[PDB]
Amino acid sequence: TLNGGITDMLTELANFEKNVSQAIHKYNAYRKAASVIAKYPHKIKSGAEAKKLPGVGTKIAEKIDEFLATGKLRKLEKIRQDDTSSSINFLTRVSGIGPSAARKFVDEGIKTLEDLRKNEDKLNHHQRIGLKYFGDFEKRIPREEMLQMQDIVLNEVKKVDSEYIATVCGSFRRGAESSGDMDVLLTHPSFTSESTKQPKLLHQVVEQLQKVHFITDTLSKGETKFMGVCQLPSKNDEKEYPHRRIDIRLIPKDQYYCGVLYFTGSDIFNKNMRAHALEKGFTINEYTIRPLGVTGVAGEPLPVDSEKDIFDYIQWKYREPKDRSE
DNA sequence: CCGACATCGCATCAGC
DNA sequence: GCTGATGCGG
DNA sequence: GTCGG
Ligand SMILES: O=c1ccn([C@H]2C[C@H](O)[C@@H](COP(=O)(O)NP(=O)(O)OP(=O)(O)O)O2)c(=O)[nH]1
Ligand SMILES: [Cl-]
Ligand SMILES: [Cl-]
Ligand SMILES: [Cl-]
Ligand SMILES: [Cl-]
Ligand SMILES: [Mg+2]
Numbered sequence: 001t002l003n004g005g006i007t008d009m010l011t012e013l014a015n016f017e018k019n020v021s022q023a024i025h026k027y028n029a030y031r032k033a034a035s036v037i038a039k040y041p042h043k044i045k046s047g048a049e050a051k052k053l054p055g056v057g058t059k060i061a062e063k064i065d066e067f068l069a070t071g072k073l074r075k076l077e078k079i080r081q082d083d084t085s086s087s088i089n090f091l092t093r094v095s096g097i098g099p100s101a102a103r104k105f106v107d108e109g110i111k112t113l114e115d116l117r118k119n120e121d122k123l124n125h126h127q128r129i130g131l132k133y134f135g136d137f138e139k140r141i142p143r144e145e146m147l148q149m150q151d152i153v154l155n156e157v158k159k160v161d162s163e164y165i166a167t168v169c170g171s172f173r174r175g176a177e178s179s180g181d182m183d184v185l186l187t188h189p190s191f192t193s194e195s196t197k198q199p200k201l202l203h204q205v206v207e208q209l210q211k212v213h214f215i216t217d218t219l220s221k222g223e224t225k226f227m228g229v230c231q232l233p234s235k236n237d238e239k240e241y242p243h244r245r246i247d248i249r250l251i252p253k254d255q256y257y258c259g260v261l262y263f264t265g266s267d268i269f270n271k272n273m274r275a276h277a278l279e280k281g282f283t284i285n286e287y288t289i290r291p292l293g294v295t296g297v298a299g300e301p302l303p304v305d306s307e308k309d310i311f312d313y314i315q316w317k318y319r320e321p322k323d324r325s326e
Numbered sequence: 327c328c329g330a331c332a333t334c335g336c337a338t339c340a341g342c
Numbered sequence: 343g344c345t346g347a348t349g350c351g352g
Numbered sequence: 353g354t355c356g357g
């Protein structure tokens with residue numbers, strides 16, 4: 001919160017580029033700067049001072065000076081005053097509705113929560129559920145609840161097959177006092193980069209979690225990635241808990257470390273690290289880290305037996321999960 | 327100046 | 343049906 | 353919007 005004002009401004013700017021301008025790179029550019037500034041250990045006194053940080057160029061430093069003097073940015077003041085942008089921005093908040101869909105709905109007069117509700121027929125499945133739990137999905141999950149959800153998920157998975165290994169990653173694994181959702185990495189000896197000796201591994205788990213009424217809805221479901229909704233059980237007379245988003249990712253057991261690295265994030269930390277890998281001559285994904293050939297083509301998977309092994313290849317000192325929240 | 331900017335799963339679509 | 347491109351999520 | 357070469 002040292003430079004909250006500045007990072008909020010950048011984040012707001014980032015969302016506009018993404019949702020309205022549909023300018024993915026400007027969006028990322030703003031996120032990087034917000035990120036680098038968010039960790040900057042000093043209260044920024046000027047754009048020049050900020051422009052010294054990597055990711056902060058001439059344009060952003062100029063905006064920081066405007067914001068510092070006035071306490072606001074005229075460019076954003078206007079954007080907030082543009083109905084179309086206001087609408088597009090709002091619609092993107094529904095899970096399932098992105099920049100394109102948001103703009104399309106707006107072109108059809110559908111531009112408010114009320115418009116959406118009376119037009120469910122014009123929504124795909126995912127968007128439907130996103131609208132259904134709109135409020136709940138805007139709420140944060142106290143870690144305390146994350147702990148309760150962890151017990152349930154791990155114990156239900158164990159019941160299906162003691163050989164499954166479920167790890168809660170994402171912001172939770174990074175130690176956050178609250179998360180936007182629960183992210184679960186799943187593995188089973190039967191599924192390796194070598195073979196799939198047992199199908200429905202993810203399905204089985206999803207089924208058990210539904211049976212106990214933990215998973216309530218589904219956004220999308222494949223053989224390795226499940227995206228849905230879940231809810232903690234409440235007691236008698238107790239008010240119900242909010243519905244929560246849950247992502248489950250089944251990964252080859254022998255590719256655990258690359259998988260846990262990826263799913264632990266943050267997303268920006270991941271972008272920065274994968275970028276660094278490229279510069280060092282490697283390419284990293286949730287499955288492996290591979291060298292980059294002279295032709296550019298990625299080679300064979302390098303041996304990995306710990307997250308640290310990945311950091312070493314790219315010449316980075318290990319960073320605890322708690323220090324990866326960029 | 328100018329190209330690169332991380333990576334990929336699932337849903338939906340168009341074209342054949 | 344298939345593939346490949348796009349959207350949206352990650 | 354920013355950066356390296
Ligand atoms: O763009 C993305 C999004 C996510 N990820 C990875 C990192 C992130 O930590 C993880 C889980 O995705 P979430 O969207 O759940 N983010 P996270 O759990 O970090 O934060 P939050 O508390 O918002 O859920 O997936 C990427 O690599 N790229
Ligand atoms: Cl762009
Ligand atoms: Cl402002
Ligand atoms: Cl691995
Ligand atoms: Cl791979
Ligand atoms: Mg998460």
Ligand SMILES: [Mg+2]
Pocket residue numbers: 170181182183246247
């Ligand atoms: Mg998630």
Ligand code: NA
Pocket residue numbers: 050051052053054055056057
């Ligand atoms: Na800079």
Ligand code: NA
Pocket residue numbers: 091092093094095096097098
């Ligand atoms: Na959305």
